[PDB]
Fold this sequence. Notes:
The structure holds 2 protein chains of 2 kinds. By secondary structure, chain A is mostly beta strands. Chain A has 3 helices and 58 strands. Chain B has 2 domains: about 55-105 and about 350-430, no CATH class; about 105-350, no CATH class. In chain B, about 20% of the residues lie in helices and about 25% in strands. Chain B is built from 9 helices and 21 strands. The chains are: A mainly beta, B alpha+beta. The interface between A and B is large, with 44 and 29 residues. Bound molecules: ligand A1LU7. Ligand A1LU7 sits at the interface of chains B and A.
Amino acid sequence: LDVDSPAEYSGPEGSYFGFAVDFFVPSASSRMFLLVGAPKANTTQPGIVEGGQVLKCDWSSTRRCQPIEFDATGNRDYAKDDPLEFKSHQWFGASVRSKQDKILACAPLYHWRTEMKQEREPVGTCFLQDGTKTVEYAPCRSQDIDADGQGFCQGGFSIDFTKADRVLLGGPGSFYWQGQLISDQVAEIVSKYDPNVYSIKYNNQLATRTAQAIFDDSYLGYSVAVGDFNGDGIDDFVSGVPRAARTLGMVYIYDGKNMSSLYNFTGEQMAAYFGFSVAATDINGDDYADVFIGAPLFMDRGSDGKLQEVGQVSVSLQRASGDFQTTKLNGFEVFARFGSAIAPLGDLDQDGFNDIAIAAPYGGEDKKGIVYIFNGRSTGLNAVPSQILEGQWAARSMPPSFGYSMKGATDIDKNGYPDLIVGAFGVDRAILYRARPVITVNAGLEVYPSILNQDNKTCSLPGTALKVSCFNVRFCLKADGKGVLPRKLNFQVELLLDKLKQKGAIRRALFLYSRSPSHSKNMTISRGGLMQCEELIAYLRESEFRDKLTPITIFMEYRLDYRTAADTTGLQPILNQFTPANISRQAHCGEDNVCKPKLEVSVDSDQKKIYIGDDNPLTLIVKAQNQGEGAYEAELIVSIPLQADFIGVVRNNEALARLSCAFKTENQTRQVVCDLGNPMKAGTQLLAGLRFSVHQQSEMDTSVKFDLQIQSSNLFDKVSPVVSHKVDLAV
Amino acid sequence: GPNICTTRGVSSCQQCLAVSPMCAWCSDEALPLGSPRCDLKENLLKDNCAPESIEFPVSEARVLEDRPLSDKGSGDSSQVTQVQRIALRLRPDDSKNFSIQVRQVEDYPVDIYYLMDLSYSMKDDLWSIQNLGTKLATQMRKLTSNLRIGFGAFVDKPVSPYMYISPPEALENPCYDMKTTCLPMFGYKHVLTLTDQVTRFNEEVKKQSVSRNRDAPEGGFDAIMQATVCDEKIGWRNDASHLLVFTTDAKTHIALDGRLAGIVQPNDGQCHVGSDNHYSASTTMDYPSLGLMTEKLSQKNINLIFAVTENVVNLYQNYSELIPGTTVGVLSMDSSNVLQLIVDAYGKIKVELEVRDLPEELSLSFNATCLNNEVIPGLKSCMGLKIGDTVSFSIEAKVRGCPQEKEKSFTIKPVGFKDSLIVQVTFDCDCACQAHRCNNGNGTFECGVCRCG
Ligand SMILES: N=C(N)NCCC[C@@H]1NC(=O)[C@H](CCCCN)NC(=O)[C@@H](Cc2ccccc2)NC(=O)[C@@H](CC(=O)O)NC(=O)CNC1=O
């Protein structure tokens, strides 16, 4: 979902522009439209103020928004100097639902003078508009007057469209606020419209009857949802009843044919408002629609054991046997109201499972409103959100309530990916989020010589007559993706020959051309199964490094050139959210192809005593050998004290090897590096004599310490145990 | 043997006193020449110095006023005594210790606010509301004495849904349809501020009558939240234990219930009662959520209590579980069941000392004995005290050098206890003998050194 540059729409100040949103898809034309309800805008009706509005926003063409002429006439008269209805301060735009050419807006706070007696009662009126004919629909404006009937129905609080063109309508206030659900066919609604009649009846109507006195003030009809829950192919009716069962909350499921009770969901926490918003959509792709019920005031135990209001969403999966499998999502902030708006998006990423958006309009930083996006996974829902949308405008005089209303599951841009519209009535704004194409790229890296021999020196280093040993590395890239995309993606391929070795200490592998552990190349890939491949030749350093223990690691990464991959609208594509951007492989004397020496050393001194006050020549006999396999770069290190001076190797003795020893002073350490042998063949024994000059004049030391160790660059047992020799001082 | 008095080159009695508390100076001229005039007093007596000529002031902590600790603050005989005068005499660089006692004798201040529903559903229960209001102050005055009492009232939000706007005349008389008189309905009004007067509270309680709304739930949570969030209007006392009794008989409107009335703005949680003692934001603000109500109740330490009839007792009992620390009682003609709640709330219910005008050259060490004869040095506070619980603090005063001011005073007092110890501090640095050595008149002998002429 693109968040960098979305579409913004604003209306008149204080109009609640964005309290309700939806998509308009006129079948007659091709352009798609945005429906935004502003339930407090100032209309042009004669003698009406704050009458409410519904606006049509044209998206692409200059982002111009205009209101729809649902009703240009002010109040009507029951008699002379006696108004019949009170259209001022009615909430026209508190609900907007569209289906192809049909637009359905409602005004839940419309008051009309009862025909029997002069009276003010909110019944709610709804304006259903077809292609050209605009009619008025008001089921609650009946002869069942007063709060005992449908006088306070407030019909139009929550509305929906059914797959077979059956408008579902909910009145929270009917029957002493017992709530009521009303459904009528669109064709019958349009046919029966008579302007001069105020109590039109419909023959095929389905309604909920008056229950006992216990179910009063349950607020049934607060929210509406339609989906198939009996297998008959006809959408049932799902409505939110936030106040039922001693304020626990409820959601009622009614048959879509004769309005019979099928399933009821009871709550767990009172005043949590279980049923504030509902949605019906299959999430795991098994075609059985599932329910999504919010409770924006749910209080769960906190870190310290106290109750914190975070908001909870309940997910129940539909089964063939009838039962529902329930899982719950808790909030992530306190006083955030997580579960206030639940908007299905369908296949947002085209992963094969539908995706939904749950919003907390009073969370995030500055309580500016946040939106959570979740993806569909089999046998449940991906409880970890995959994206975060945050409000952008600070409160002027009203909490911004970004995310109080969203509508999804429609592809405004026409690129195969559904978009989303979010309402910001607190700052009277609307935001359209265009989805991005999900490209899944699979990378294949293979190194043929998993373990290679330095002695396989049949590879020629370019530019020199020297010979090296080189290996083959294969890397391939393929790109598959749905939706509208360019045919070619200009991938950027980068790779490194050596991982770990922190702080850039040393790197052993260099490529054949332009020797370097790293290499970058821009390659073009075509969408499909064409697995384009390329090959490279690289060679290692012989005695240029002392680290053969850790395996040589080959690393590859791929970054897509987003700038040139965008469409004409500038909407750049995206890579898969779950794919690993980096693939790493490890590369590597016996059958194991690992030379494992076994280094031991012994020290003997010709002189057991050193006299203080004169130069005492000390000759050291060192017996060095390897019991294991070949030891590359094997050397002898002899740590001598500051008062000991190396003179040379004993050469007058034929039994002592005349080693090539170099005395080196590195970081206050005086050492004699003796070259024992490059390969240090197995079973070889080395005996040598080293003479030293001792200028010991200190009166505190009792003996002189010498540290001799065999070192090598090999993998296993590359260093012999440290041997310390003490020559006692003499007086 | 030699000690600090004989090694620092002391040349006068003043210097001997200033060097150490253990040092004593011999003013006797019969002391043999060469013997240390400044030394331990035991050495001086061994040196046969005259005890009269040995100047060894001893620090003393004499009690000036020790009137006995009181038992009850209602006793008309004598003033109430919780903590009275001490006198400290101190030589330089020496320390002395004394003990103090503080007991909670005064009754704990208590604030009780009354919330009443003036809706038509309780015309049969208004007598019970008024009787409960009377017995509240009647029972609280017989246990505490710093009581402040008051009340406000609520009906519901005054908007179309709940307000009878249909006839142009029924606004002023919502009982028009049944041909009866009643008051216009209101969101919330704060009638009587917290005040010690019981007669005014009873008279204002007995002059309250019902109004009429439409739906059974009543906006009492707005009343609770505005009572809690407002401090100066209600008149809450920072020291008293706050109570907020709430009365109703029907269900209650909760948050997001106001979306029907066209009100969607969340409960801002700010005091909005204007200059007319009316809820000025009852038409643009939603009902508050249980979380915000609990947050503010804990913020201002208010112990909300539910006094409801039998038909909503279980509903409000279950509502209490989500608002921790609140109980429920049965509102009837016998209000003892809910007065027991107030009794226990009072029975459920700090000593910390503060130093005033302490001399800079003096230093104090605090040893606190709060409970079970346990002494914690270095602390000055004790928690968890009831009526009759007596704590003690051991205070040691140490002087730095010798202040030029011979006499100063300072007061040690517990916070909010009035009763205090006034300490009189006298510094004994000069010897009595101080009141020819310089080669027979060749200089001035001051501070122990001879300034030759
Ligand atoms: N069909 C139903 N009765 N459903 C249950 C609803 C019950 C609900 N009440 C009733 O029926 C009874 C009918 C009288 C018989 C004694 N009970 N009326 C009441 O209880 C009145 C006052 C009264 C009390 C007792 C006797 C007489 C009159 N109290 C109210 O709160 C009013 C108005 C108000 O102050 O807002 N009603 C509502 O609030 C909701 N509306 C009602 O009708």
